[PDB]
Design a protein around this ligand. Structure first.
Ligand SMILES: O=S(=O)(CCO)c1ccc(-c2ccc(C3CCCC3)c([C@@H]3C[C@@H]3c3ccccn3)c2)cc1
Length: 235
């Protein structure tokens, strides 16, 4: 269908295999911020003196489904309503109705150079592995090469592997009556592995992540709740 079908399958399954695991009981993850059901963890990792710190967060969001949260996360048309760190983005290629390649630049984090990034963004529904398990909706954004990447002399090229992974729990339907948003809960696992791609001072990157990831999770999840309130549910 397109040349990244196989790569998308591998990235998506790697997340299904490894990113969903619980880390509440795992001392290898440091719990760095908690704000109610929002739990943000990371591991301190450097390669060549450059911070890579794997970031993993869980959250539980009332009144929205995983399909909704993934649609709003993936849909480039609403990106600017919730995103606060992007300076410019351009859709570089459409691969399928569920997969695009995006070029974007991020607001500079002083005193490091601005970063840019070039990634495939894909949204998939992953069927329940057994009839006992929840279905999953996942967006994965992972860096790829491309010939129509911009020359941007201000920016160092970061590389990312991010996933927003959602499972949705509902009260079952009571005969012929729909499920209300009061009875739905979206369990989120969000993972972000970011390679700044060059020099950046470690303590500043760490302080910035510790502040901006929870701000992002809070703003984005509230944004989905606000936009879906009183709209029919899209399961
Ligand atoms: O969830 S997504 O796919 C949403 C689509 O954009 C995504 C999230 C985060 C990034 C990201 C890119 C660059 C940087 C750093 C690297 C060196 C200097 C800039 C960071 C650091 C961690 C801080 C950060 C955290 C959360 C949101 C934005 N910024 C994060 C990219 C994509």
């Amino acid at each position: 269908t397109h040349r990244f079908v196989q790569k998308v399958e591998e990235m998506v399954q790697n997340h299904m295999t490894y990113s969903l695991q619980d880390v509440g009981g795992d001392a290898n993850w440091q719990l760095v911020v908690e704000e109610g059901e929002m739990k943000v963890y990371r591991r301190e990792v450097e390669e060549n003196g450059i911070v890579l710190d794997p970031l993993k967060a869980t959250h539980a969001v009332k009144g929205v489904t995983g399909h909704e949260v993934c649609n709003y996360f993936w849909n480039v048309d609403v990106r600017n309503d919730w995103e606060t760190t992007i300076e410019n983005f351009h859709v570089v290629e459409t691969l399928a109705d569920n997969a695009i390649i995006i070029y974007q630049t991020h607001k500079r984090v002083w005193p490091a150079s601005q970063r840019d990034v070039l990634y495939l963004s894909v949204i998939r529904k992953i069927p329940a592995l057994t009839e006992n398990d929840p279905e999953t909706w996942i967006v994965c954004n992972f860096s790829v090469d491309h010939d129509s990447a911009p020359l941007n002399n201000r920016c160092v090229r970061a590389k990312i592997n991010v996933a927003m992974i959602c499972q949705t729990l509902v009260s079952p339907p009571e005969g012929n009556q729909e499920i209300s948003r009061d009875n739905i809960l979206c369990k989120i696992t969000y993972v972000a592995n970011v390679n700044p791609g060059g020099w950046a001072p470690a303590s500043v990157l760490r302080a910035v992540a510790k502040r901006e990831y929870p701000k992002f999770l809070k703003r984005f999840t509230s944004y989905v709740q606000e936009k879906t309130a009183g709209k029919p549910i899209l399961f």
